[model samples]
Target: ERMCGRMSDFCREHKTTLRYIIWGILIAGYLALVIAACVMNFHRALPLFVITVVAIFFVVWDHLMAKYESQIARFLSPGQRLLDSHWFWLKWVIWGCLILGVILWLVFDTAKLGQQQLVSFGGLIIYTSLTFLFSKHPTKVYWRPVFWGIGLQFLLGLLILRTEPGFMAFDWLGKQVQTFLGYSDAGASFVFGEKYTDHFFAFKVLPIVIFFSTVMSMLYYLGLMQWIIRKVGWVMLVTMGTSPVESVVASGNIFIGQTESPLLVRPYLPYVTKSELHAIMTAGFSTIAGSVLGAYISFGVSSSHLLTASVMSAPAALAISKLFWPETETPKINLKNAMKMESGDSRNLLEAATQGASSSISLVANIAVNLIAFLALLSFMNSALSWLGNMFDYPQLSFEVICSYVFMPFAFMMGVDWQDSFMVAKLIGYKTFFNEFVAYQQLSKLISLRQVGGPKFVDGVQQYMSMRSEAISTYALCGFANFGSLGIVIGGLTSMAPSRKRDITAGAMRALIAGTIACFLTACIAGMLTNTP
Candidate 1:
């Protein structure tokens, strides 16, 4: 109420000049910071500066809208508004400038939009259209959120990959995460013995999940994680206009898992509507938890891209969720009060770490079992297919070859090289059907083979993937979406709030689809920004 009162007074006093000042400062300060960061430790300063500036922009913009909603509403499009209504004109102007900037960049900058990029851009258009075509209720689709999701993601991709400062910063952060996770190797060696831990994936990599889980727990216990999660949730609420609890859970999922994130909003679980529940579950599938980020790094995925993918997926999940399941009923929980909920998950820091480590035992075991079972299944299928092929005087009938034919077109559409699209597509398929870990393992091997000119195939078929394809493929494959997660999300949510079990179950399949599309959308933007001649 105090903030609201202040905003109301400010709106009446500074109506005409307010918008220009806010935006002018935002734009001028933003560019100045970007330039300054480039002159400093570009890698460390760029991402941190971007995030801080964006957050301040959102908070100020939201506060203005909260008080002057009626006055601001006039500037918005007649239909459901896409961007926030408060800065409606400014948003369009920025977008126009962005489009123009991209054109200039292509003509005069290092980045070039060639035939391959054009085709890939067309693929992005087609893929987005397909999401609408497959929507549960196309007529009810919220165009605003969908467009916002796509536009912002593309903007972020450009900042992170195309710009020298952004790329350096993100790359530096990735290396830091890799270095931090490396500490787990010492713990694994102490327990499992150094010789046993020498194999990267088998013994060294998976153990990091347990250690990171404990660290996250300690952070949460100290209230740092909760504070960060709440701030992120607040931004989502202001920008996406999602329900408070839904925003919190979605944001929390970026740093934690599906089941674990909801615990942050446990008080409102029973009161969450179907649409909100779907958003929560879909967000879980769209992002990887920090606990397993180490595991992914060990698989040779870029840490910066992985981190960016997780951050970008939060809003995409909300946007795609609403598209699939538009809200029809009023929420029962008071959105503001819901946002104020405390984040005391456990009694003490020690308990929090102990409990987190204990819970991760199941997660680590589950990952191990999934890898074992899926690899065995792949092995059997390949053997059977190979036998059938040999009998028919054909030889290269492997699992990847089969999936490549199925997914290659989609991969090619995302701007991967046609020469390497088949292999990249197979990785996507493996991630979808099996899991990201297995898919990333295959990606590591693919990258290694491409680098060293090692044995490319068992059937004497040699293929090399370009650096562009590898980068795009990394974005494409960075997600938690998979068939197996459908059950986990359903089961997790239902167990947490039995009263909403039916609603959670009903929306499970849609959540899975939305999650997958969200990740693909991020991948498309990354491809668009990073593509070269």
Candidate 2:
């Protein structure tokens, strides 16, 4: 009564006034940033303008939506009379022909078909077959999730790689992210000295992680990430007919890493079923966090491909997870009660930034120590293996040599050229046994060697991969699906839901398997569209 001044209409008018002022502050500040960015370089205008308009559009959407939502909600009522249909399979054939024409135009018609494109589709068939063959309950498995998941991934690839505006949008999105991440370099150099920051791994990359975390936290605090995740989750839930918790978990993993992904959905973690938790863990395994992305980006892999793979794998994670471990019972929780990414009870924005920075410091330490220990450990194993091979006049036999040979079939299955299969397989081996960052660093090194027209022969057998191989393997390596990350993802989830520690720890292996293959799924689909002329 005191706040309302004893007038209900007056209270509503005051609230409306408050909303406009808040909107004005956000919009005015955003316009200033974009305008300032244009002054620095006219070329930055169009991309920044696209981003700004999209961002502000959402802000205006909130206002307009407030004035209108319930009526549209009533208008969007879905119906079910499909059982009364007749031309079913016949109509499907004609429908398929029409869609197939578009598919061919987008994928096959414009390019020269090669072993890469053909084997990629075969790779898709093989990957799906393998998952089905080994599924927990093959008979009970619902194909809706699998079909929708791969279809979503396939269409995303077509949009990003096959179309003009689709390609242009992601291309600019990557650039904007690059520039955003680039500012962290300024902070790093200021604190650590340019010479040290130039070559120091922690200084060069970790600061970028910290900056990204701050922005992510700011977004979460502002409810932007929550809004994005909720709708993306809604799309997956509606399309795939899956449980809401799992759908949202898959959506969260796209932008963040495994450890942090669980944190956002901690409210429902303990209540989620084994299968739901399995999907969550699989999503975590199948994608990389935006924090370490700068690390991979600086290593010279195509930043666009890295970002695209992360986006594409969100759905595939659910597909493979369900294929590997189908839902056995009704979900204990639903979307209405489960969807929330609260800002961790932070008092204000500054505290959110503080928490965000400190959280990334832990991740920075994780990456730094992993690099120091495992990389050296890999060398020691190579020394032992090399020594064992000396007696047989195979002194060059090392850990990587065995990895190349062992994983080569896997790479071949994915449509990498036989000539480049060894390299792709070797990187996969590194990603599996070690971590993705090392694999990507090696990938960049290999791509660079070929780019500069170097004497590409170590033995002349395992030269650099071709462009298609680079892109496919780039998708392949864009995940947190490695063994080392396995420990962290599980460990993180266990802490979030200690009650389900038993189920979470037990499902870890399956999640990793599903996650790895899900990456392959995205890679194979990408390989299908990336046919070389």
Candidate 3:
């Protein structure tokens, strides 16, 4: 009642109120911070940093350019606005999309795993990217935002995952030498502890994921993540010229997941154009959630390699999306944020630490729950498939057989040798089918058996005059891209914007495609870079 009465009293006194004031405060504050970060410019900043700044500048600039739009001034007041109603042909187009979605639901959903899923991957690049490109089309949109987004995704992924670890290792060595006369015992233990320090933590993948989650949370709390986001938004707005809010939301996904990414731009939600919303959601659909990265790594796979693979995919996502759907010109010009970033929720170091710890706990729980249910269900399915195989005169109708046939071609494209194709194909399929956890477990077994299996395969190769083959398919699968991710993208996106549940659901198959290709892109790069016998 107190709040109601206060609002009523304020309403009586003024036509314009506190809402705009709040928006100004938030946007203005973020803009100031962004300017500071860009100017200070850390020497070690990654390519993704460049991508973020440029992409955000384009989108935000385009949106601002539209606000002052003079062509419609004759029809409505400068402040009055023209595109107020959703009843026009503009909105009707979206409604038409609803019909298309319904038709898809009935005809396309029956096959749990088949060509249908693969088909969606091709369609998603066009659907989601176009939706973003044309979102503010005809009014205000710059093609530059899309370019920046894709470029940044590629640049960041390449630098952080592919290049940074080596660089960081070099830095650590120098730092260690400076502190101690020679390599300290602990430093030696950290490095050369096998091929990589990641091995020490491989069996307990849970902790690393948990640790990274905390680091992510800390970055969020320290005003670090938000700072990077705003600068990227500004740079993209200025360079590419696009909607600031849309670019902000899209860029946020690269660092965070579908759900948390949206939370960063919640204030701008109602104001975002439909196409922008779709782009934001689809990007989420195309990537793995940060919360689950660790659990996926721990699934009996090489922790270092898997981590590097995921980081690599981050950049490929943006580059591929832009390649598939280029941005429009109106959104490609200089831009600015329509809304401000929310204030940091953490009160102090203790509070921030607690939040980070809590985030890790949540991740551990999610990994545990998903792995348990998936494994239990997988065992049951294996029994059923085995029985069916016997009845049908087949030797075994296992998960490996399914993945071998379905994902092998893509795996081969990603640079798997023909001899190792079926084995790697099964791993990709397993990652895509159930989750990376199961996929890695299988990979470990395949690799371990190679010592004995090597002789038989070699004899067969010599007899057949075909000698090229991997000793064991060790650390080869696209572990992060898999079946479990499809649902994660859907559930996470829906929770953020309940309104877009239909659009997201209809695009489920597309998400799988985008995600699979994104993984393959990473794998291809890894295959090119890694030393394989």
Candidate 4:
């Protein structure tokens, strides 16, 4: 009792000193984590961890500003209010750095790419201006987020895909993810007999969705996914100045489906403003969920590119979402007090896993049904188009062929070679119209054909895309933006927050536009930074 009383007295006498001491210790711990990650050779992880530390510091600084506003205001000049109010100068600094960096990269890195780099550089300007032209509030558009989005994605592509150490780190992770999926295949084989399961995607691989969903649920129940999501959400919230609900949902979209991620901020759904809702929906379109990464990987897309796309998309989503639908209403949720909501499905681990497994049944069924229906429709359409084309003695007539020509100009602008732009454009069209799953299947086929030369020969020579075209197409196709997803996202939101149904529906097309532009933006960056031999 005497010791406790003495401790209380000391706290009362040295409260300020104790507060500084606590902050110092926390700062030291944060630095130690960065040091340890570097020392342990976690090259990819180190960059992400360092970003997290910077985000935390940003939050802490904001909190200190609030705590000592009176003291802070004493030193500020009249012009400094806006400058200090939102770190306004920092945004301009970031924009300047990105502009300078892109110029330097183009001059230095494009020597291997030839004049093709000019197409991509020009595409960035043309596409960004098109997006701005369609903006609801173009005058109020916050250009800072635009530059931040582009800058962050460009830097990450260079670090994760270009550098030796970074590539090795992600390459290691890709193998680990692949191995984990293999274990799920083993379970499938045991349950459904090896021969049938091995040959059929339905029985063989779709069941992997259930396994992955259950694992995610377990992670959520254990608070691991929540922690990670919160950190990421916090970073996005500060960097992009998005509403808390939008930030959390955007971060959640990286790991979970568009429909599934809303459950994270379920409590705030009804109250979410139109702009925030737009951000959430747009972000959903701009990324692929982690649960489906295994399936995409199985379809022959590189796991590293898929992972990097998802990581880079959060800021991109914010960039385009805000530009398309600038926020006009005061946010109902308090950003300062924002907290990560719990799943609340269950506390028991096994029970949560079982629940997750049960929930995935309809998801797996939906995938199978969607694919079969879309493929059948596409086949019928292609057959009719082929018949019509034959009447004019024109070959290469199909839905994809038409789409390829229609979007070929855009594809070429995205740094695709003129020789292969039509083919890449077809993949983009498929993704935008049918679904990413179907597009990925086509991409897988194309990759295989390219590996064995082209399906068609020219003058005793087989034609194939340059490695640069392949890389650009890979990044371009890495998104969930499509008409079908539009319906799915709208249906999900309507069910969750019926009061906002009209507003949600209203923003649906704009969200689709924003998402499409965001993915294209990332593709441009990847094409810019990727050095081809």
Candidate 5:
């Protein structure tokens, strides 16, 4: 007997999507977890290993079935076979990296003395090693992608971090952006009610998002995006690495939604292979949209830093993709002579500007709403936690603190110092459950208290807060990890192939997990290298 059910009905509506039940499972599981945490006492709390085992069991099982199942077998037989057949190598590398990484963390006993410092150092080493070792493309020639990606990310990170050297460029760019937007220095000054000359508002580096959006728009309209697409497509061809056209669209994510970005590569839609298409779709889900950029910048993070982080993440993503799944093709696409994108009907200059400005405005409003609602809910939850902690004779049990405690093992394995691993992992958790904005706010607050938390008097031994590492830590945490992204992915992908909505929904949560892991992996490395000096 077919019992009537909401998920069943929902699945029926999206039957073509390979993701139907998988999506429901993810959501239901997550909700159950939250409820367990909130309502149940410590006695009912699930053991970390048990939770991890469950997650691992499901993920591994689903991944194997999804790739090997008959449905996926048809269109992408060769690609699926390659991934499955190489399971031994990939599994060995992944486990080896995790195991070796932990071993080094313990051997150095890095987090033992300085705890946080050691973890960062070891984490960096492990990530870099893993990236190189697991690279899909051979390192002999295509290593420049990593070099460029890491080099660019590091340089940009430092550039934004460089309050002195970059101040001028950041400031000038902010002013230019405002002027172009028709908000004069005088009007902006009056509107901001602050020294608008500073990059804080008037010169806020966030306007770069706008500038990038407009410039990208002109390029797309003028077929310039197609040019870059071809160039990158050629590299992708050689490396069998990147789908250059899809990448261009993915890159556009920094300034637009998934649908809007794909419009730039609309011409390439029909030809993209199933695996290549999956990669593109996954990448789209992995990163965030442009709408949230400014608020993230404004969410207690400096605008200059936010802009730089976005730029940093763009290249870093490419490097991560290559490392996680490298390209190996005999005859690559010649991007140099790839197909050109036809001009989209963006209308005249007025229409273009209006569209761009309208998009920006809507994005800002969405950010404002999301931030406000999420924070309010957080406040209520924190208050409840406080009440519970008081009953337990504790000062308070913050959701943040619990998250840190929850993910501490993973963080520790990643090389975070024991004391810091807890908090860092907590930040990662917050970013995953809520949004990165809340995580950053917590980071900022913790940093501000650094002076208070620093070592007192005679001890010259460096204290935890003395490292002044929170900035880099927050920088790494700030990104697209929240419930909203699931919706975004479902909405974005299905629109492209209403038929594949099931697959998209099914893989959505796992994709989120993969993406979160990707971000965490990078952050661990970033935390490690940032301490090198």
Candidate 6:
């Protein structure tokens, strides 16, 4: 049906015969290209076939929306109306039984729940309830989206963490990322000498970030990312039942950077509802960028866990954002904004590639200098603390101990073992106070310390871990929801929409809390999945 009807929009004159001929010609050419590619090099056939299909799919998409969108609205209306029906009380009973059913599946039949799972589950309740109870406009809050986000996180985490098949798949994908990154290594080697071959951060990791930005720019030009984001964004919009732009950008956040996600709504940024702006800030906070993901993976953090962390956080971030600042005003047209994902401004493919490659230079420079300064500052800060502590007869004092002491309870709630919780909390503090890179670098060093010498005393104290603690810690630190990112998001977003500067500044601090709570929820969910059969 779409095949024939799709052509008619182009052939408004005859509206049938000419359109069919045009379609036939294009279809014939598409087939010829596929066949010729296969004949030349069979490996090229898949991409040729896929490229044609994607173009067709996009054409069909716009046509369907153009012609039968009202019909589709009726289709969507029924599902939503049913969801908000008066028997909303019965929904509680269903959720009650649903919760118990899951408990039985994970505990009795699936095998006894791990201790950390119980702790993690407990933390989940606290994070959810505390956010709701403490919210300013508590009575005005919407309940559905927030719970669904948490509900989906449970299932999502369970699938990837508990299920063996899913774990192996993600684990393989993590290695594939590492393997994919080796291409960047070769590119670096060409220019930077054998110095680049070592695990030098500036030479090794920054190159990965730059090369990755280039890949994304090229992908942006090709519109491949549009199709992928559209499918996922549609699911988010339907599931959350919120502003469509929020859903689209959050879905984009899973793979793209905070700076990049909002570009999808380039036209709508200034006119967005306060809640939508909050969602934008929160989504940015909850996820890491691809450039930094390579950096994290290079630190030997379990790439699978990091991947799992990102995928589970987006909807959860949306849920938290809504609860923190529910939409009070009328949202702009929802469907159109969700679909407004346009491509880049480069003239052609080579132009995109050229512009994309150079674009990374500033980002790489930012990262290198940030680390260069922060690491040196941390050393001096610790030195000053020691100097002060020596007078108090407690010379062991350092910023690490203070952070560990402060956040230990939060870590314990996220299912770290009592001993490991202190260390996990320290990482959280570092990530919150400074940035995720410093936390990850410190985490990688600690994990390396554990692996090599087996808790041999390096600093007159035993640093240790269990596999469970490591996974939860990785999940916990997987965010951009820290002080520095708060500044970056506020500054960057303000530049994008100067008129909304006050709103951006106001909403961002709350977004930081939303982002943190989302990260905590991810940790809790990950913990619940641990040791499950």
lDDT tens readout by residue for model 6, 1-533 = 99887777666767578779899999898788788887888675777777778887878988989799899999999887887885579778888998899777767733466666777888888888898887858879888888778877877887887688998988887787777866887898888997775767778777887788888889989987887888888887777676788888898999888876787787789989888899898999999977777668878899889999999998889988888778888887568655777778888988998888897676667666776777788899999999999998999999989998999889999888887788888889999988888888888988887777664555766566677788888998889877656666777799888999988988888889889988988998888778632
Stretches > 4 Å off in candidate 5: 1-121, 124-219, 222-240, 250-259, 285-312, 315-339, 359-380, 383-391, 410-416, 447-468
Candidate 1, after superposition: displacement of residue 47 in Å? 17
Model 3 bad stretches (over 4 Å): 1-215, 230-251, 285-308, 322-335, 338-340, 355-367, 444-482, 527-532
Compared with the true structure, the alpha-carbon lDDT of candidate 3 equals 0.53
TM-score of each: 0.78, 0.87, 0.55, 0.81, 0.56, 0.84
lDDT of each: 0.78, 0.83, 0.53, 0.79, 0.56, 0.82
Q: Is 1 or 6 the stronger prediction by lDDT?
A: 6
Q: Return the clash pairs for model 2, or none.
A: none
RMSD to true structure for each model, in Å: 10.6, 4.3, 14.5, 7.5, 21.9, 6.0
Residue 263 in model 4: shift from native, Å?
Answer: 0.9
Evaluated at residue 172, the lDDT of candidate 1 is: 79
Residue 147 in model 1: lDDT: 70
Q: Candidate 4 local accuracy as lDDT?
A: 0.79
Candidate 2 RMSD computed on C-alpha atoms after optimal superposition onto the true structure: 4.3
Give residue 238's error in model 3 in angstroms: 6.6
lDDT tens string, model 5, 1-533? 36668778877888767586788889789767766774666545555536666766866976887677887657678887898999977978976886796578546643444555555555656666755664444454355455555655555555555456675675454444434544333444555567665655324433544554555566666655564554544443443344565456545554455445666555555455443454455455445554445445434444554455455555555665555555444324334322456675777765665566555554444555776777788899999998889988985688876886787766665554555666667677787777665677776666555646655333642234324345455545645757765675566566766766556665566445445545555455445444432
- Tens-digit lDDT track for model 2 on 1-533? 67566677776769978899999999789888889888888785887888778876887987777778886666554333343354566667866896787567646453466666778778888999999999888889988898788889988888898787877777677776777788888887888886855576767777877898888887888887888899789898989898988888889888887877777778878989889999988998889888677667767778778889999999999999888999998888866776766665688998988888888777778877877888898889989999999989999999888998999888988878888888898899999988887788889998888787755677856566678889999999888877777777777788778899888888999889998999999899888888673
Span of ten consecutive residues with least summed lDDT in model 2: 77-86
Tens digit per residue, CA lDDT, model 4, 1-533: 99999999998999999899999999899778777877788876776687887888877986997799987778766557766776766878866886798678778777656777767878887888888898888787776677666666777887997788887777667667777877777788777886855467788767778888888888888886887888788877676566788888888888788778888888778888888888888988988876567777877777778788888887788877877778877888876545557665685999999998898887787777877887788899988999889999985688876896799987888888787888888888999988887788888887777777745666644345566777788788878898766777787889888998889889899888889888888888777766655
